[PDB]
Design a protein around this nucleic acid. Structure first.
Ligand SMILES: [Zn+2]
Ligand SMILES: [Zn+2]
Lengths: 56, 192
RNA sequence: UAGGU
């Protein structure tokens, strides 16, 4: 099959690029909750009304 | 005489909101009298008000032009990397408007429709920058029909209140490094 | 309920 050949034809051209699942993000703001909300889930926060969208 | 003409999703269509069909966000929202058809299957997802541009803050008038470019790249890098875990990302657009329906909106178009559904199912339970994440499927398909034409060349005379997407483009270095990094991640998961 | 077919 030519699939395995074409796969190990592109990996060599990408020998000096880091795959995106490895990329070290220095200060990623994901999953960062406001102070006190460590036990509050995201769904409970939206229904509480303390975090409204700009339209409302 | 080759095909019947139509006006679906057009500004002449008075029963469907043309702005929601092309841009994915209307200034009237849930109070609009014209139809907002929300797709059940879509390749594009919407995260409203995710990018808070520091220029529109009470104290963010202290950064230089080079510092602003690195800050926006830090946001786009943080966005593209996280969305890539839900499948292949075809395009990522960030809106730099101030209207309440388009300010800081983040659109992500996946390659497969199932990838988009799995993204909104997980993003609605996560946080970002001390705020809960709102995620939903957006009917946007072609971003060219949703971007402001007078904003690509020079600037739009309507300013930040334009109802079309004023997309803030990142640095070409980051965009290229991200597409190459995704291709390797997809190649390394195809070799099994 | 618009500026964009
Ligand atoms: Zn509408
Ligand atoms: Zn504009």
């Amino acid at each position: 099959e030519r699939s395995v050949r074409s796969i190990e034809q592109e990996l060599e051209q990408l020998r000096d690029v880091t795959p995106i699942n490895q990329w070290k993000r220095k200060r990623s703001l994901w999953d960062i909750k406001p102070p006190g909300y460590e036990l509050v889930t995201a769904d409970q926060a939206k229904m509480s009304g303390v975090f409204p969208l700009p339209g409302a | 005489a080759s095909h019947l003409a139509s006006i679906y999703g057009t500004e002449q269509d008075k029963v469907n909101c043309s702005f929601y069909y092309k841009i994915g966000a209307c200034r009237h929202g849930e109070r609009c009298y014209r139809k907002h058809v929300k797709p059940n299957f879509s390749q594009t997802i919407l995260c409203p008000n995710m990018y808070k541009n520091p220029i529109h803050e009470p104290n963010g008038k202290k950064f230089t032009q080079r510092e602003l470019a690195e800050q926006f790249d830090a946001f786009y890098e943080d966005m593209f990397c996280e969305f890539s875990k839900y499948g292949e990302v075809e395009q990522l657009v960030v809106c730099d408007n101030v209207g309440d329906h388009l300010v800081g909106n983040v659109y992500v178009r996946f390659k497969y429709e199932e990838s988009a559904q799995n993204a909104i199912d997980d993003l609605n339970s996560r946080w970002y920058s001390q705020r809960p994440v709102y995620a939903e499927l957006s009917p946007v398909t072609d971003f060219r029909e949703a971007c402001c034409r007078q904003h690509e060349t020079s600037e739009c005379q309507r300013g930040g209140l334009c109802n079309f997407m004023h997309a803030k483009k990142p640095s070409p270095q980051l965009l290229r490094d991200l597409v190459l990094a995704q291709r390797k991640y997809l190649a390394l998961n195809a070799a099994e």
